[PDB]
Symmetry: C2
Subunit: 97 residues, 2 copies
């Protein structure tokens, strides 16, 4: 797939351990941040300062590529933030004409 960077929100939708999450492609962060309000409460979290998933989560995209991330879980943010931990596993390249 291709996505131009525009003023619009650059979004990915994908699964983490078989639940769907949408969020903002966030090249400026090393790690992924999931909103606490979106966090399945049966899924265990631990402090580190911010909370983090206790378990690694399997991410899967709609083309069935997959891998592992261990996101931070943070209250009071507008959107999930896909970090380079995830983007680097999807082999995403930035290109200019």
């Amino acid at each position: 797939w291709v996505q131009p960077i525009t003023c619009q929100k650059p979004s990915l939708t994908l699964w983490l351990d078989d639940k769907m999450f949408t969020g903002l492609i966030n090249t400026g962060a090393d790690v992924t941040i999931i909103k606490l309000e979106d966090w399945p409460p049966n899924w265990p979290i631990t402090d580190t300062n911010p909370k983090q998933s206790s378990k690694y989560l399997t991410w899967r995209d709609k083309e069935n590529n997959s891998g592992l991330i261990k996101p931070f879980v943070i209250p009071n943010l507008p959107v999930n933030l896909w970090g380079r931990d995830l983007l680097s596993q999807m082999k995403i390249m930035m290109c200019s004409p």
Copy 2:
């Protein structure tokens, strides 16, 4: 040019008016942020109440009073009006700038 997304910092070096800046490609923000320590002090700023709390910044950032001409090393250029914020580790190139560079994200 091509730049894969890796664990490493995705960086661009470019000019704003007559000065070179390096910073982090920051697709999560719609505005560009310059660290105050890198801000030429002769360049005028305006205090704002622009809420950037949502992109993990302040609710009262300074902003460049003027538009700045950005130019890359291939001599593409355009205009942005970045925020100027103390005590950040790196300059943050937002989609205001990235969208003027015609940057596409691609997957194999």
